[PDB]
DNA sequence: TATAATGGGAGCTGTCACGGATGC
DNA sequence: GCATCCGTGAGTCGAG
């Protein structure tokens, strides 16, 4: 097929097609699963071994991976991959903080305190001070991560007209503006479904803004 | 603020927590049975972008083909690491090689037709059919295949062997097939009366491969 | 360490597209959009909702969030419902789903592929009031607009059509952000034009142009007053933390008096005013004192009309205004007598 | 809205006096 | 166990 209909290549008579001289060659580790019938999974779906894909369940998945549906080649391809969850930033850290059960860590470190090594006893103490601090306090560790960022009352970061009729203002306003701008841009970038390597950059810049 | 409190609770070094927060490296919440370099992925492991891409999105690579050089392998066909993909290209990995933007598409068109040939009875080997490469006959002396019709000659030479089609006006009156070992004595667009030699068969003669 | 170097590395990861790869991705994107349209025609669903569902499944459940334009809250439940109703289509109809998915994937790979061009364009925009990285991200937004608006049929390379949208988005950002007090984009254009004009005039005249010269140079409609008002309106604020001295000691804000909260003197004078007024209002009868007090609003802070004080005291508006008159008059006499309330008149 | 354009720059230098963390 | 790195301190009022 081509842009203009007169440049197209149509088959004159009955025959078979042979591909020669590819511009390049793409080598992928993948498992091929040809299909003669309507396929139950579309492109992008992640699939474990023993999953239904095409032909009403006659053909299944051998490996772990990601589904590339080829309509041209009439084959369901699976690129070998896992479902593995790996994150970045304060969201991941907030997760790991939320997951922590305090008493368990306290007791583990207590067992760690009986160890003969001086260093290990030391580190166990240092950690246990933090853990017990959070415990006795009633403050959740995940609060060390921010969701809602507080805003100082305006009068404490004034925008004021001086004698000359000119305005003078605090730097906290510029910092807050940086924060808000990068944040909003992140919300719009997420709403529009931008790639990773973009959202990543934005998130990084957001953290540096808060900092 | 050292020692880091967040870093303390989660047992993460300054460099590690920096890498995670500032987006240098991924950290794994639920490995979901992931495996890297033969070892299974333990929770809270640090992965580079290379490693996370290899694990999550799978491994792949593309190699260039210099213009006017045909691939030594077929589309869809399995490959082994080190196996040369082309005269100038060697694959670094194992898997399914795929064609990217083929420059030339060769179409083999199927043709089923009917054509006659006449041979001395002693030379012929009787067979119900002739597979490619199989001997059609064996001739002790040079023999001249003669035209059994009059007309203009359409000569088409295949990879080996050929076809002659005689036509009066616009309608073909004859089709002769010349197998291997027969040299055509006529050219395209020539006029032949009945009885004049179209070709010469010499020695052994056999079917073409195509 | 250095965020810019890091981002340039990440960008340096994705390879550059050959003309073939580019046209292929572009085509897949366009045909994908078409697929979503036809799919909306078949299903009768909203093309937007469909697009967000396909996008969701391509990106994964890692990214799922409610979109402002959508009428429904987008969550794995609803996207699973919709995706399942998409999986229930006949083969020829269910084909368009695969087309859509392919489209989205092509889109992502396209953006990620062309991310370098944005950097190369934004590196020339430094110093204009925005950070390098901010410029890069805005340029990325531009790139996205370019991808979604691109048509490969014109046989143009992607760079040519992308550059326009990238520059446009960057410029829009610079105009909409870099001022602490926000100014409309057209107004910013006018101000920058005024600056280019003034700079040209100063380059020809060998001196800073007056308001009149700039006015004349800006054509008709521009007088000196307009130029001055434009410049005035363009004045940026100054930091309160700017040092006034060699040492760390002096801050500019330390010299700025607060005019808002009343001084102790003003407060004491207001107090003595209230007290003296209560002194002079007690010299009346409680009725006329209360009428005056309701009319001037010393009681609730607001002034009642003649009808309201007359309805409250149970007399006519003429009568209530009359006793207001005599109260005020007695006050005038008392004031002409003791002269206690004269000093409060400033 | 369409020739094509695809990895950034400035560092900035005569203080100790260190404290605790990190490293062969 | 002992060299080495990173962050945090380094006088007061006055005028400016
Ligand atoms: Mg004028």
From Swiss-Prot, chain A:
Belongs to the RNA polymerase beta' chain family. The RNAP catalytic core consists of 2 alpha, 1 beta, 1 beta' and 1 omega subunit. When a sigma factor is associated with the core the holoenzyme is formed, which can initiate transcription. DNA-dependent RNA polymerase catalyzes the transcription of DNA into RNA using the four ribonucleoside triphosphates as substrates. This is DNA-directed RNA polymerase subunit beta'. It comes from Thermus thermophilus (strain ATCC 27634 / DSM 579 / HB8). The lineage of its organism: Bacteria, Thermotogati, Deinococcota, Deinococci, Thermales.
């Amino acid at each position: 097929a081509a842009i203009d209909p007169e440049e197209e290549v149509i088959a004159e008579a009955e025959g078979v097609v042979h591909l020669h001289e590819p511009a390049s060659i793409l080598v992928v580790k993948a498992r091929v699963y040809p299909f003669e019938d309507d396929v139950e999974v579309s492109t992008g779906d992640r699939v474990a071994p023993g999953d239904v894909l095409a032909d009403g369940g006659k053909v299944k998945s051998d490996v772990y991976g990601r589904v590339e549906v080829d309509l041209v080649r009439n084959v369901v391809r699976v690129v070998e991959s896992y479902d593995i969850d790996a994150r970045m930033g304060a969201e991941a850290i907030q997760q790991l903080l939320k997951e922590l059960d305090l008493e368990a860590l306290e007791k583990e470190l207590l067992e760690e305190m009986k160890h003969p090594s001086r260093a290990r006893r030391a580190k166990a103490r240092k950690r246990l001070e933090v853990v017990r601090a959070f415990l006795d306090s009633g403050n959740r560790p995940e609060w060390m991560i921010l969701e809602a960022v507080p805003v100082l009352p305006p009068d404490l970061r004034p925008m004021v007209q001086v004698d000359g009729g000119r305005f003078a203002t605090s730097d906290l306003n510029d910092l807050y503006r940086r924060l808000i701008n990068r944040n909003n841009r992140l919300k719009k970038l997420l709403a529009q479904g931008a790639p990773e390597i973009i959202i990543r950059n934005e998130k990084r810049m957001l953290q540096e803004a808060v900092d | 603020d050292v020692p880091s409190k967040i870093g303390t609770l989660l047992d993460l070094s300054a460099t590690e927590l920096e890498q995670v927060l500032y987006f240098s490296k991924y950290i794994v919440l639920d490995p979901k049975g992931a495996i890297l370099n033969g070892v299974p992925v333990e929770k809270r492991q640090l992965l580079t972008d290379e490693e996370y891409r290899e694990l999550r999105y799978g491994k792949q690579e593309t190699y260039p083909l210099p213009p006017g050089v045909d691939a030594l392998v077929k589309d869809g066909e399995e490959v082994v690491k080190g196996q040369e993909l082309a005269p100038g290209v060697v694959s670094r990995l194992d898997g399914v090689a795929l064609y990217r933007f083929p420059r030339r598409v060769r179409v083999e068109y199927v043709k089923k037709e009917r054509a006659g040939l006449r041979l001395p009875l002693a030379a012929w080997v009787e067979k119900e059919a002739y597979k490619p490469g199989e001997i059609l006959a064996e001739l002790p002396e040079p023999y001249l295949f003669r035209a059994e019709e009059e007309g203009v000659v359409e000569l088409k030479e295949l990879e080996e062997g050929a076809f002659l089609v005689l036509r009066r006006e616009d309608e073909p009156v004859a089709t002769y097939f010349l197998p291997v070992g027969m040299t055509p004595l006529v050219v395209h667009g020539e006029i032949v009366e009945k009885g004049q030699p179209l070709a010469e068969a010499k020695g052994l003669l056999r079917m073409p491969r195509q | 360490s250095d965020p810019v170097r890091q981002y340039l590395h990440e960008i340096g990861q994705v390879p550059l597209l050959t003309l073939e790869e580019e046209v292929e991705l572009a085509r897949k994107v366009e045909e994908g959009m078409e697929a979503i349209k036809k799919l909306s025609e078949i299903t009768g669903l909203d093309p937007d909702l469909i697009r967000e569902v396909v996008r969701a499944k391509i990106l994964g459940s890692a990214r799922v969030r409610h979109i402002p334009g959508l009428k429904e809250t987008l969550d794995p439940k609803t996207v699973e419902e919709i995706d399942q109703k998409l999986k229930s289509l006949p083969k020829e109809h269910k084909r368009y789903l695969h087309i859509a998915r392919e489209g989205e994937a092509a889109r992502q790979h396209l953006i990620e592929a062309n991310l370098r061009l944005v950097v190369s364009i934004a590196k020339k925009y430094t110093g204009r009031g925005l950070s390098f990285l901010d410029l890069i991200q805005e340029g990325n937004q531009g790139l996205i607009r370019a991808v979604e608006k691109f048509e490969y049929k014109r046989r143009f390379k992607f760079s040519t059509y992308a550059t326009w949208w990238i520059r446009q988005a960057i410029n829009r950002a610079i105009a909409d952000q870099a001022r602490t007090i926000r100014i409309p984009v057209h107004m910013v254009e006018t101000i920058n034009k005024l600056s280019r004009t003034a700079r040209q005039l100063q380059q020809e005249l060998g001196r800073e142009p007056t308001y009149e010269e700039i006015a004349e140079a800006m054509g008709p409609g521009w007088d000196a007053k307009r130029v001055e008002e434009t410049l005035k309106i363009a004045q940026e604020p100054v930091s309160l933390e700017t040092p006034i001295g060699d040492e760390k000691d002096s801050f500019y804000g330390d010299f700025i008096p607060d005019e808002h909260l009343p001084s102790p003197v003003d407060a004491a004078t207001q107090s003595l005013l209230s007290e003296e007024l209560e002194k002079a209002l007690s010299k009346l009868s409680e009725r006329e004192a209360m009428v005056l007090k309701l009319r001037k609003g010393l009681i609730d802070g607001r002034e009642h009309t003649l009808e309201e004080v007359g309805a409250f005291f149970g007399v006519t508006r003429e009568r209530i205004r009359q006793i207001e008159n005599k109260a005020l008059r007695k006050l005038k006499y008392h004031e002409s007598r003791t002269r206690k309330l004269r000093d409060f008149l400033d």
